[PDB]
Design a protein around this motif. Sequence first.
Motif, PDB file in Angstrom:
ATOM      1  N   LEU D 110      13.917 -53.690  22.166  1.00  0.00           N
ATOM      2  CA  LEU D 110      13.285 -52.446  22.606  1.00  0.00           C
ATOM      3  C   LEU D 110      11.891 -52.235  22.030  1.00  0.00           C
ATOM      4  O   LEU D 110      11.050 -51.603  22.675  1.00  0.00           O
ATOM      5  N   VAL D 111      11.555 -52.915  20.942  1.00  0.00           N
ATOM      6  CA  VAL D 111      10.295 -52.620  20.267  1.00  0.00           C
ATOM      7  C   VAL D 111       9.183 -53.519  20.778  1.00  0.00           C
ATOM      8  O   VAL D 111       8.110 -53.046  21.168  1.00  0.00           O
ATOM      9  N   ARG D 132      11.655 -52.496  33.372  1.00  0.00           N
ATOM     10  CA  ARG D 132      11.915 -51.282  32.607  1.00  0.00           C
ATOM     11  C   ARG D 132      13.264 -50.679  32.976  1.00  0.00           C
ATOM     12  O   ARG D 132      14.008 -50.218  32.103  1.00  0.00           O
ATOM     13  N   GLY D 133      13.601 -50.679  34.267  1.00  0.00           N
ATOM     14  CA  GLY D 133      14.894 -50.163  34.682  1.00  0.00           C
ATOM     15  C   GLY D 133      16.050 -50.986  34.149  1.00  0.00           C
ATOM     16  O   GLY D 133      17.068 -50.442  33.716  1.00  0.00           O
ATOM     17  N   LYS D 134      15.907 -52.313  34.172  1.00  0.00           N
ATOM     18  CA  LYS D 134      16.951 -53.170  33.619  1.00  0.00           C
ATOM     19  C   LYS D 134      17.121 -52.932  32.123  1.00  0.00           C
ATOM     20  O   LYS D 134      18.249 -52.890  31.611  1.00  0.00           O
ATOM     21  N   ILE D 135      16.008 -52.767  31.406  1.00  0.00           N
ATOM     22  CA  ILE D 135      16.078 -52.480  29.977  1.00  0.00           C
ATOM     23  C   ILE D 135      16.764 -51.142  29.735  1.00  0.00           C
ATOM     24  O   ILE D 135      17.573 -51.000  28.811  1.00  0.00           O
ATOM     25  N   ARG D 139      20.153 -50.405  27.636  1.00  0.00           N
ATOM     26  CA  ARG D 139      20.209 -49.365  26.617  1.00  0.00           C
ATOM     27  C   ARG D 139      21.400 -48.445  26.841  1.00  0.00           C
ATOM     28  O   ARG D 139      22.126 -48.115  25.896  1.00  0.00           O
ATOM     29  N   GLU D 140      21.624 -48.034  28.089  1.00  0.00           N
ATOM     30  CA  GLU D 140      22.753 -47.158  28.390  1.00  0.00           C
ATOM     31  C   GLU D 140      24.081 -47.841  28.084  1.00  0.00           C
ATOM     32  O   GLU D 140      24.986 -47.227  27.500  1.00  0.00           O
ATOM     33  N   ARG D 142      24.727 -50.322  25.972  1.00  0.00           N
ATOM     34  CA  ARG D 142      24.926 -50.468  24.536  1.00  0.00           C
ATOM     35  C   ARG D 142      25.196 -49.127  23.871  1.00  0.00           C
ATOM     36  O   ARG D 142      25.969 -49.061  22.911  1.00  0.00           O
ATOM     37  N   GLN D 143      24.587 -48.049  24.371  1.00  0.00           N
ATOM     38  CA  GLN D 143      24.892 -46.721  23.850  1.00  0.00           C
ATOM     39  C   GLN D 143      26.353 -46.362  24.090  1.00  0.00           C
ATOM     40  O   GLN D 143      27.031 -45.837  23.195  1.00  0.00           O
ATOM     41  N   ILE D 144      26.856 -46.643  25.295  1.00  0.00           N
ATOM     42  CA  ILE D 144      28.258 -46.366  25.594  1.00  0.00           C
ATOM     43  C   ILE D 144      29.166 -47.165  24.672  1.00  0.00           C
ATOM     44  O   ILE D 144      30.153 -46.643  24.138  1.00  0.00           O
ATOM     45  N   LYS D 145      28.849 -48.446  24.472  1.00  0.00           N
ATOM     46  CA  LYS D 145      29.679 -49.278  23.605  1.00  0.00           C
ATOM     47  C   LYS D 145      29.643 -48.786  22.161  1.00  0.00           C
ATOM     48  O   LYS D 145      30.665 -48.816  21.466  1.00  0.00           O
ATOM     49  N   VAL D 146      28.481 -48.325  21.696  1.00  0.00           N
ATOM     50  CA  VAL D 146      28.376 -47.802  20.336  1.00  0.00           C
ATOM     51  C   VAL D 146      29.230 -46.551  20.178  1.00  0.00           C
ATOM     52  O   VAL D 146      29.947 -46.392  19.181  1.00  0.00           O
TER      53      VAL D 146
END
Lengths: 245, 201, 549, 190, 101
Positions: D110-111, D132-135, D139-140, D142-146
């Motif tokens: 992401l950086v 950008r949409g794929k990234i 992100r979404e 990995r957020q759900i998995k976290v």
Amino acid sequence: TQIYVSPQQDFSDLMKSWKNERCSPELLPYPHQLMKRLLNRISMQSQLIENISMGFLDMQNASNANPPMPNESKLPLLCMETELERLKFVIRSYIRCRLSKIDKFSLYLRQLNEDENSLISLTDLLSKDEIKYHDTHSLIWLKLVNDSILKYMPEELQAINDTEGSVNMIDEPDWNKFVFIHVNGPPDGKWNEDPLLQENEFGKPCYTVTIPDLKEEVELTIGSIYVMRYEVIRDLLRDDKVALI
Amino acid sequence: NDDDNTEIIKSFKNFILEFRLDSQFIYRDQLRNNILVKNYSLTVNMEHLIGYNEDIYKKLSDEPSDIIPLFETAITQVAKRISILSRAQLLNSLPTFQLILNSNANQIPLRDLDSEHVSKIVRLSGIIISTSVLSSRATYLSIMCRNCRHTTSITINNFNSITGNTVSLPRSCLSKNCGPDPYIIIHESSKFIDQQFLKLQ
Amino acid sequence: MYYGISQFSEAYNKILRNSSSHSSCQLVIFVSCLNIDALCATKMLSLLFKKQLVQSQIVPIFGYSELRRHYSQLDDNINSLLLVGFGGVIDLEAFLEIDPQEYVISFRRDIYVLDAHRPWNLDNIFGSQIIQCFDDGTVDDTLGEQKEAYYKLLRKQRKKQIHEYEGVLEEYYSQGTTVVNSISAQIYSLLSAIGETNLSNLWLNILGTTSLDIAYAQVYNRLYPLLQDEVKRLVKTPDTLTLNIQPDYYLFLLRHSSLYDSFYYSNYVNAKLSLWNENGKKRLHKMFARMGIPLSTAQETWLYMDHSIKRELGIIFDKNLDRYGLQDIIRDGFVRTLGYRGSISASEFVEALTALLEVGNSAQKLTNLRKRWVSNFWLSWDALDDRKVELLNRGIQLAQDLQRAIFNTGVAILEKKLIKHLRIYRLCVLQDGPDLDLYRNPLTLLRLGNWLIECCAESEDKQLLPMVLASIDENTDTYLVAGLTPRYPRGLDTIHTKKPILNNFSMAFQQITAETDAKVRIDNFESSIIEIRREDLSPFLEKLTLSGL
Amino acid sequence: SLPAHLQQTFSPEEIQFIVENEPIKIFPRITTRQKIHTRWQLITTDDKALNNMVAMRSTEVVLWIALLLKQQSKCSIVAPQWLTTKELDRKIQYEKTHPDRFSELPWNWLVLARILFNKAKDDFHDPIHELRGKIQDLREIRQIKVLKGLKYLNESHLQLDNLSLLEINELRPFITEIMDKLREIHTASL
Amino acid sequence: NGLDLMSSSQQDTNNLSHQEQEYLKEYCDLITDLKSGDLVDIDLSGSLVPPSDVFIDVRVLKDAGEIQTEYGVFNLIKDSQFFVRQSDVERLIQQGYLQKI
Ligand SMILES: [Zn+2]
């Protein structure tokens, strides 16, 4: 350290020490030789850049002559000065973090320093200017608290280093704080000559630590981020086996 | 018949998943923050919809009551997509999401409403004088038979677009020799929402 | 000429050789405040010099006193000075007591003056090496005769030559002030010759060229084809940038206000239909009824207005506007679209910029007003970037408010008939009224005067006379007087456009000030705007009546 | 430094700095190969690459030097392998097919993406918006998995094999404090 | 910077006790002495935000005269915009004389 592979190695060691100190809940010892090299490097680099700048200035201002070509001239000195600024920022952050830590734990380190049985000495942990800072700050704060408040209480409890009664006044560091670690493994390129690492199924070399409170054993493999307490991880961190994030 | 509905739902899903200005997909983050706080609703600004594409705005302005349920089911499809892992295949207690609109069109006074504003989107202002007590409305009804005695489920939306809009009971049974409408309502295992009436002056 | 169009790059290179430094600011720019063309040129230069990492400073100024004081403040370290938007018409060396031998070593400093006003100082051209300017193609052809006299004037029968030289100098002088070219156009020509053109530069050039549509339509018509050709030479994904030549009309914020309000506040339609009385409103309702647009529909926002009539508006206008003589309102303009934010036009952008300049946020209060004007200039400059739109919506709403106020004042002036018709020039004075505190801004006063000039020109009178307008600010007890030139109707052929109407008001003012001890203060960059005392106005006016114009 | 509680965690600016202190590949536009000229002679970077360089060839420099040259017309940053649609497709397929494992991904995740999309906009072969949409979708996921994995917090330890720097930083204070509270509760109970 | 900024924060600092004021003076003395040792070439009381860009735009906030720098001079005209190096104006920005970083 005893010798340098390259100044980049010194830079990496400085950054790793900074990261270790920033998140460590305990005041770690002092890497004298690294900053001894770094300060001399900064001084010589600054002298070189100032010398070349002054030379070009005299060339340009003695007469009209020819102005320096923008190619291969502005960009190099720009790079040197910005790199020096970045390095100074890193060193400044490290020093200020150390100052804050020694601010917090003044009484505890002073208490341990006067103990003859303890093998650790204040000289190794603190630079000389830090020693002067600690002692003078402690004396000034003691004078303030004695003039303001301690002048009126009776003799029974005038000392601010009392460790009797209900509540003690000395703040030991929290050795059980949870920290984020990355198992860097052995610094050697062989990464298989340590006497500590073992193996599990599918290879996966690992280190086995134990928690006396929970009577448990935890497997720590290479390349996995863990969240584990600090009391038993001091040795691995000191041996550069693991790196704090 | 069904293909046009799927095309419209796909268009709305593309709009909600694609709308970004600068470096932020605002609506997706709005959905995330709404779901995290158990507020299954979404707010659409009309200017963004107009700017993205004009055909969807034209269709919404033409027949609002028919079009809106397609959008409000596309929203819940996207929410289940971007909130629940399939896991190579549960609770799934997500009802149909509520759609809320905002706009900055010219106001219309109450006395100026006439026969030409039937089934149109309007904006107006007034004063609230009384609020009715809340009542229940069915959304998913469990229907049971008497003679053949089988189970069925009825899905009903709240938009009507007409006076009737109501499928009371199917004629004849689902295929022996039952009555015209031999069905009852199983009140348990049913889903209900809340409705309220207001008076404006 | 000193610097021809072909030589620009060379001068540019010199700037680098005198300004490219590591840790030293060696370039200072002074800009003509309260001018759109100067702002556009300054933005283009700022981007150019940010590209090559050349350190610089931008300093706006308002009056000649500020110019002289800031020049005195400067240090010898500054090798290069830019003076954009002014300074052409006067000799700077006499103003700035510049000693060539103090700055000889040659080229101790460099002062690049870049101005548009066609009549200027000939000595500033042919006398001094230190002062240098960018010619637009005027000295090479027009000034072919005056230079001979100047060079010759720089046995008893030789006085004929001196007399002829003096006569030639006098004939060259005594000419009214005019503008014939654009600073942004010159800068874009330089950029095209260099090879750094792009869409931002094209947009800024378009703004700079369209800011002159109100007053210098001849210059605008001369410059339009080059812009058209250049924009020809150069799926709705959220990052598309579209610059298209779409038809547009002489209408006030058509795409941001209702069509009714646009037709109502458009100056040309106001002049052509006499909207200040009730018959104008009756004729406007006739227009709408015959076009067929419902009144309640036409009083809606352009976003929500009906798609069918939005599509058919062009045909509706083409079929309806012929009867009433408004067929000159149709023209071709530039439309900018970036992302899903919407569409904008150059005319609307310049109106928003002008309004944001006008409204934003004795000697002491005059200084405070000038400081507020400088701050408004900075705010308008900051609003240029595409990352800010709350600084443009505010400008649009302020433009609407200011146009409403101007209309409200103008209708009252017209109905009270305060326009006094003298034998030579018309006169009007705003002694009292509401919201008079707004007209302390010269650009607001010029907007009001432009509307009055249009209204007067769109009449049956066959007399072309200059108009003098005055205002009051009770805190200072002074009259702010501006001189205005007559204008031809926009719907006229080019045959009767041999030369634009000249402005002799500055010359008359300076002559009267040099012959009488009036308590005036002529410091504005626009030489036709002066500040006069309430007690001193009337005799001064009499003098202006009795003096040769 | 202290600044209130800013002594315990890294600021996002420090994260960006430590990420941008990394090597990257570059296609130079100019040449400064020594005449067989001023030596770069830096102190924290191999100057041999910067000195021995020639145009239209591949070489490795630190990221901030590459950005500085990109501010001028002396640079053309080579995009990494994992910034393309065909790799992100198999990546997202990997997370979707595996509902328990965090996918393998560099910790500069992401950086470098933010920085490259901010500065190196015109050098990508693929359209920017799609990447950008794929990234964002990654992100979404990995957020759900976290969020799914955080539901259990043992008092002994925890493992997170493939979390990037920012994901670790934005979660450090909450996890740290909760675990410390649980640990001290257990310690006081025995 | 250990100067207590009496030129600009509370003005009189009289809300502090006299003992607290002398403690503050002693700590300012310690701060001055600390950078007088082996770290004389590093500004310890400087900025703590990592350097990210070399050139920034700076807008003047308060009016002054002209201030000398290394190899150059800056004249602080009220409401002016500079295009200068980041690391040359950090002292002014910390003092509050410049704005719009
Ligand atoms: Zn049946």
